[PDB]
Amino acid sequence: SMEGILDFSNDLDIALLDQVVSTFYQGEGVQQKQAQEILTKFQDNPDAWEKVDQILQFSTNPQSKFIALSILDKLITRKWKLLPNDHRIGIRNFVVGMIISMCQDDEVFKTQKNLINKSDLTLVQILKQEWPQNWPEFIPELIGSSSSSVNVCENNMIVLKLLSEEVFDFSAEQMTQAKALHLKNSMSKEFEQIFKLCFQVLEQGSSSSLIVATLESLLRYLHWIPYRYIYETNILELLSTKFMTSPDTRAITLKCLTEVSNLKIPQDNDLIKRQTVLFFQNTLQQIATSVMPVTADLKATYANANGNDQSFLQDLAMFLTTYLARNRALLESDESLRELLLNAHQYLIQLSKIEERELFKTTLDYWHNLVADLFYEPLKKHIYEEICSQLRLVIIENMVRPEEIQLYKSEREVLVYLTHLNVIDTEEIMISKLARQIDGSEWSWHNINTLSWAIGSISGTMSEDTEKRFVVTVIKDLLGLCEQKRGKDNKAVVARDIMYVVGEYPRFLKAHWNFLRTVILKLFEFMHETHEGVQDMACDTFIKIVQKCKYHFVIQQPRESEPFIQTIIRDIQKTTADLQPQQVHTFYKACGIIISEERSVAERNRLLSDLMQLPNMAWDTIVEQSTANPTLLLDSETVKIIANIIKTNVAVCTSMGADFYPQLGHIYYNMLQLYRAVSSMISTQVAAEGLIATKTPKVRGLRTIKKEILKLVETYISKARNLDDVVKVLVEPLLNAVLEDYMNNVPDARDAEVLNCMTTVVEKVGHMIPQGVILILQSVFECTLDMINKDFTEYPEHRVEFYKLLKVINEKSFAAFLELPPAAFKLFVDAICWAFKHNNRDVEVNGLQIALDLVKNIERMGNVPFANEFHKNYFFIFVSETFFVLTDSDHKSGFSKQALLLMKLISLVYDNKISVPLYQEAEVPQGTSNQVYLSQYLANMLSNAFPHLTSEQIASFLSALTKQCKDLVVFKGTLRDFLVQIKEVGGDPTDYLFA
Amino acid sequence: VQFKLVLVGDGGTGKTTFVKRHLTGEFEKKYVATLGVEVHPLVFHTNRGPIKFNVWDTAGLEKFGGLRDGYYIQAQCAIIMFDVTSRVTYKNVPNWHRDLVRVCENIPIVLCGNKVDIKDRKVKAKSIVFHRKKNLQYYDISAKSNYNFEKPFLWLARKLIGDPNLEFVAMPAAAPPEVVMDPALAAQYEHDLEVAQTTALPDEDDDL
Amino acid sequence: EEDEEVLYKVRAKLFRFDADAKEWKERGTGDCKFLKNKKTNKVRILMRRDKTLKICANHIIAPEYTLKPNVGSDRSWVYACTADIAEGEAEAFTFAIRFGSKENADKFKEEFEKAQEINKK
Ligand SMILES: C/C=C/[C@@H]1O[C@H]([C@@H](N)/C=C/C=C(\C)C[C@@H](C)/C=C(C)\C=C\[C@H](O)C[C@H](N)CC(=O)O)C[C@@H](O)[C@@H]1C
């Protein structure tokens, strides 16, 4: 029954529409869903706009009228210009009349704000089409009708606000450059009269609703209007006194004054400076007398969350920070302004105590600005000493863990500056907070943690001697706390925090070997603790200390028989005996860091040999057994052991890089034999069990072995210094073990890691192995392309790695694409365009880059047959594919690289850098330049794709585009102009002349 | 005690995925673009009793947008969603906010940057400040890891009920019934269980 | 739930099989508890989601139930449950529950059998 409104052959039953709409807004479940679909189809009917008059007149449901206005907006914004003038004026007059009618009825004005505001925006859409060229008296009539009625005056302020937003705030992406400038200049030309009205309403006042709406429009005006309208009238005074005293206007006024603080203002004018000071003085006075004194507990207020207090306090923080960041120097020299400066800052201190993460971040940005300047600026810190002292406590009490990367960084930076400014104050606050932990008054896990993070953050700011005394005090105190505390949970928290602090003070460790030794030995003790988090923190602290203090483990310290690294390795089995595999890998990685400090080759290699002793011995046993009984690879336990050996190798290779080669050489042959054996097993199991085999623990375990082997090779080759060995020793056995195995497995069994490994090989040694690169392409190219060219979703890893591999090959070894058969090269071009059509930024960006690099590679070849054939076969494919993704609205993230590619292609022809005709014979007079033919092809292509554009539009656009093909920024603007024009009918072709 | 919530943001940002996780607990890996709007009731249990959100999960893709701002009418709260792995989705946050507040002038709004589980984050913490001048609450979230995934609703509930100490609570769990297995469906099960045992569980690399 | 004793607690993710989609769908992640009712001595599984604390599993550990391996996992069990009341109205589900480790999955099975024996009285 509800579907009757969709039948346009009959007149529309308004009461039926109102039912459908009610069922949608107020209905439930199945009914709501059906109405939903019906309303969407109604609204999207291209003739629906013809029913708008009827609905606006005879419907009694304001939701129905709202939807009618949506329908009209689609017409106004897309197809307006097809309407005859008399009809456009008809609609215009209907909308204006409906707004005035609704405003003149007090009941409706009060209760139908939704429909009125929607009407106002519909009107603004008409102004964007019609005004001022076709409606020069709009503003006079608006100003005029404002004195007739307070309701109309108020609503007129909403219209002017929305207009200002559409012209200044949201025009950039919604209008052509030329149209935006036109409407900006138009509003500018008439602003004088608009301001006169706004000022009068503010001066005369009375209606708070009217005052507020006027101030809302002013906030928008402040984005663009010149400073004189604020500074050369009484309006600054009104904002900063009267409108701050009443709470209905205070919120919007404060936001206005924030924007006032950001106006472009003359710098060398003492009167303007005094005005800037004065409005601040006024505003802060009004707050102190009408809202809350400087002493108020804003933490408590915000927490209680009465009325709009939260927003107000947010807005106050924004005003204080904005104003003070620009103008605090105005308050710093004159001693009559000292109290004002410090009070404003005191409010900020109190705001900074509010428990509200994002507000804290806003104030923190200000504090960072202040304390950085006090660090550099001369004769300044003395002013802010008490402010800075309070802030130290605020920051210490709010320190977050370093895992919260950006916030920790900001907080550390502020605290570091504050520490430099008064080291003793910072020290005292920290020691006394530690005392509160010890005396139990402030004790908690959260609290000892945050304190520890804070103590750690300021490492490096103190003199080495002050640091020494400080560190000792803190460690003694924390050790005492640990003892006091009863139970493993408590002691574990304190122990982690001790570990944390010590790890943050490498300078101290480097000067006190005996202490450093003790710390490591204690960390080793903790690597035997089952209690959760302790082994992880022990290992993480170990590697952190190693990263910073590694030199101290590689030398023989006085009163030691040997470098501590030797001691660590001798005892490694016992040390690591209770660790999980991941922890063991960290440990071995840490040892690797130390070993790379040894620059005597022989001693380094022997240390490496010794570290790798246990994994190598387990490896050697399995190698024998696994080969003898290939069933052993079916043993879950064996597969786990093998994976962990490889992982241990990866861990050490990660920290040692080029130094790892002798160890990779030791295992290389058997490792690639194992890769082959595991590959057999996987294939065997998929044969016997089906694709499902790939989900089983056994096969996932086998594949883990293959993936870690590829990761080990990738890790080494990416850091290798001796590339001659890479090529002569590593590459050939690698390609033999991995390429055919990848090519001859079924899709679901192919490891994308293979592609990633090959990318690294080509990256590092591509130029040295032209035949290897050819072999890589033959093995992976067609079989991978076939996996990913059926949709955009299957095989996501392969998809991404595939285009990375083509990218590096096209950069480093373009000759491999030259040796492709014509048909395979055509698949290459299809592949590149395929990547363009991807919405995934990874694939898309690489697609565009390959295209760009390929064109450059062709250009390099100069005037030879391959390059001429390339253009003949593919230039137009690239031009049209690029226009497709530019214009289809589904690939906006690729816009810049699309523009760059398009520019490069157009410039090739504009410069005459293509040696043969691009057109085939008897298609055009045989002398015709490629420039003229390109114009012709594009015009035809765009006309077909966008038939609602005029020939004049298309010709102007292409004319501009070709002229601008050496200026990326302007070119990009012309493209965006076109993207706006294709969304509507009747776009002005002169817009493309914009300068 | 029920409130209309509208959910807006660019296509693919995770609106529907996030709601579904809340409704049923599942994580949908596939992207099926919403058509117009999907409406679903969602209840939380607080220390102040139950609160129902009437969730209008709207379409972010222009071509599937349906009634657009029509969906915003009489909303009492909102979530604006973007994807921290996609810069364009953040660039469009002011556009969604614009369209939303023109219809809903004085409502609590949470801005949510989804997909913080992905390592290669593209919209950096430093860049996200739009919420400050507009008095939006902000959370980093992940519908996939459940990072902060209760926070938008807990915050909105505190705002709508007008109680800052409101908590989500465990409702007491009724004793479950004893079972009676129909020997007529005995075989039925053997089949259904056979299928289930031989369909692999997803995401076998995850911590759970 | 103080009329119940906590026999066993373990972190888990729980799935239900959707025959229509022929796929496993997550139901919840959080603490799976075996609760012994101190009146009837009956043991149930009760599981609540992290963050929301909503109920994703509430059923008796019926003696007839059998924990089976999933082809994909060495740390999960699947079993049919004929009456779960997490979402209110008792429904039948094919459940899978996955744990942090094989050790945990094995321990779960041990306790699940202990619970079955208790429920047989
Ligand atoms: C240059 C050295 C100056 C002084 O050296 C004193 C000397 N006894 C060094 C001791 C070092 C340690 C006990 C190792 C300690 C600082 C490092 C860690 C990670 C210790 C953790 C705690 O033992 C945790 C806890 N006590 C263990 C538990 O009981 O659960 C300790 C102190 O007076 C000060 C640092």
Ligand SMILES: Nc1nc2c(ncn2[C@@H]2O[C@H](COP(=O)(O)OP(=O)(O)OP(=O)(O)O)[C@@H](O)[C@H]2O)c(=O)[nH]1
């Ligand atoms: N990694 C990751 N992926 C996510 C997350 N949330 C959602 N996704 C995925 O991203 C896609 C988002 O899809 P939807 O939730 O349907 O997106 P939407 O914003 O509702 O889209 P429209 O309905 O078109 O506006 C799906 O593939 C999800 O599986 C998240 O937190 N992390």
Ligand SMILES: [Cl-]
């Ligand atoms: Cl050193």
Ligand SMILES: [Mg+2]
């Ligand atoms: Mg959706």
